[PDB]
Amino acid sequence: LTDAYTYANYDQVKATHVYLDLNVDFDKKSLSGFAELSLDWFTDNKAPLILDTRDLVIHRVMAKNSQGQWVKVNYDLAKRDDVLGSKLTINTPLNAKKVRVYYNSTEKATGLQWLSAEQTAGKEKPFLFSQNQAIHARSWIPIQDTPSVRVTYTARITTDKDLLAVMSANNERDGDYFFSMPQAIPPYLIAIGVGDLEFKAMSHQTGIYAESYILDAAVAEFDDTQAMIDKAEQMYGKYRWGRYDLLMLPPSFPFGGMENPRLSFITPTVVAGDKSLVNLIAHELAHSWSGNLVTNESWRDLWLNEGFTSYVENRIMEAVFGTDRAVMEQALGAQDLNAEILELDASDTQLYIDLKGRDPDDAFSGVPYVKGQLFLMYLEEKFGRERFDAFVLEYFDSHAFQSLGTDNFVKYLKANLTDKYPNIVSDNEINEWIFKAGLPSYAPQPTSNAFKVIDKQINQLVTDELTLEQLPTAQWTLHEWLHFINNLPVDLDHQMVNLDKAFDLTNSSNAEIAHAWYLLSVRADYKEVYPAMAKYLKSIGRRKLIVPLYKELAKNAESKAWAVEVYKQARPGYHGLAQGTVDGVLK
């Protein structure tokens, strides 16, 4: 029961399957039908089935008694929590083997985005998609929303004729689809998308679903993913899910992607045209092992997820693209970790983070990913890949479709590494790594030559105050451009213009570029890139591409006001998960 946030008494009862009978109503913006949990009881004496819910409407609850008869049981729907929602206590027959809840979700459901046909690319049909991480599955599924509880699911979804349903299971149009996931997964991984979707594959087990405009552009961009999976299997074990597809969501998607088994939800912001932001997909394919195959039991073990997924993400990048692309990305990333540790509370920089009773979304940083990566990179360098990678492979094989907590990871990390090959790493470096704030100083600090030739170059003194701009720009990769803009000095102000007029980083195609540019601009007061930044902020709603922009922007009361004026235009359209965040950084 290492886990607040769940009213679910997963102590005595545990659901092993979920049959969903739902109807997708776009006018009422609600899914309505029923959830049929199949349970496994541990205690011989009577106990209630406690389930998590949110802005769910309950019609009736049934359970199967000692004689398989669907009898009506009664429930209590507790007062709504601000973060956990309303606890549903259903009074179930001693050992009820099943329970059927009849409900609907409401449009205020926090785990679902209802996009009007106009907020879509087709402009003709609306679009729906889920995001159930961390604790939003309950907003449209009465269940034990806990990463500690894994269930298989089958689901009968009803939609309109001329709309397609997708989920994180096997899809065998008409408007009557039924999906099946025979693989036990925690709820945050139950996902659904409905819209005017088209499908093209790329390989034998990889394809894409999208709105046509981005379809072929997307298939041209991730046609490497098959490679990700073959190189990834080589070192990490088999891809136990069968198929791996990509679901491009509309520009409104708040994140960069969700690792929904068999169907990763990807932001359109990565279809750049040059394959530069592709580590995102290598990153979502990494979850297949960390955070999907083996999942954190609570949200304080969230690093066992992002950490390892970030580490494996890079490896897959080295294997298919080469270690120079690979460490060019570890550096670029470690620079932000350092920047975040600085703006962060010296309590959140810990790996086994304390949530303090916060929202699993509020309490969220880059820490567990990069610091959890440097951590495993530390054990790599310490033991070697042979030994480290054999261990990591067993680690995934041994926890196949299981849950794990920080304390136990340690027990295993010791019994299978740190103690297997003794006297290399001490339990002080282990404890220090996962429990203490900031970085250990002896923490790997990936360094990229190419980057660092640039470092030397950024030294064109006061400005064209040694060297012209006849640098190797015409050879600069996306990575090499973010490093330039990134450690370029914040004292260029206007001084800045050669830069934009020569390379035009303002109207820069790649979004990452546009980002780092406006970030630096507003910092140095390059006040010139405010209009382009406006459309940018109004257009895209990915958090990690507007959030930090709204932060720096909202730190000069005169500037912080320009924010509210635009955030009042871009506000509608953003995903709730984003609005929420920007709503706080904008006072």
Binding site feature residues for a peptide = 131-133, 254-259, 542-544
- Residue whose tokens read 């994140």: 255
Which helix (H) or strand (E) is 318 found in, with range?
helix 303-321
Is 369 tagged catalytic? yes
Contact 334, 374 (CB under 8 A): yes
Q: What is the DSSP letter of 80?
A: P
Q: What is the number of residues in the chain?
A: 587
Task: State the angle between helix axes of 323-343 and 449-457 in degrees (0 to 180), rounded to the nearest 10.
Answer: 60
Cβ-contact 349, 370 below 8 angstroms:
no
Could you tell me the two tokens for 467? 């060297």
Q: For 454, list phi and psi in degrees, rounded to 5.
A: -85, -50
Determine whether 432 is an active site residue.
Answer: no
Contacts for 351 with CB less than 8 Å, ≥ 6 apart: 303, 307, 367, 368, 371, 372, 375, 406, 433, 434, 435
The answer to whether the beta carbons of residues 544 and 366 sit under 8 Å apart is no
| Integer Cα distance of 515 and 391 in angstroms | 39
Exactly one of 36, 211, 221, 284 is catalytic; name it.
284
Q: Which residues are annotated as a binding site?
A: 131-133, 254-259, 283, 287, 306, 542-544
C-beta separation of 72 from 62 below 8 A: yes
Q: Which residues are annotated as a binding site for Zn(2+)?
A: 259, 283, 287, 306
Q: Is 463 exposed, middle or buried (0-12, 13-18, 19+ CB in 10 A)?
A: middle
Burial level of 524, CB count in 10 A (0-12/13-18/19+)?
middle
For residue 103, the number of C-alpha atoms closer than 13 Å in the C-beta half-sphere is: 26
Q: Which 3 state secondary structure label does DSSP give 455? A: helix
Listed in sequence order, the residues at least 6 apart from 304 whose beta carbon sits closer than 8 Å to its beta carbon are 290, 294, 296, 372, 404, 405, 406, 409
Sequence-ordered alpha helix ranges (H) in 458-558? 479-487, 497-503, 511-524, 530-539, 547-553
Vertex 332 angle, CA 371 and 553, to 5°:
95
Q: Which tokens go with 122?
A: 């087709």
Are the CB atoms for 316 and 295 separated by under 8 Å?
Answer: no
How does DSSP classify residue 1?
A: -
Among 177, 244, 352, 369, the one annotated catalytic: 369
CB 62 within 8 A of CB 27: no
Query: Which tokens in the block code for residue 475?
Result: 């050879």
- Going by C-beta distance under 8 Å and a sequence separation of 6 or more, which residues neighbour residue 124? 117, 196
Catalytic annotation, residues: 284, 369
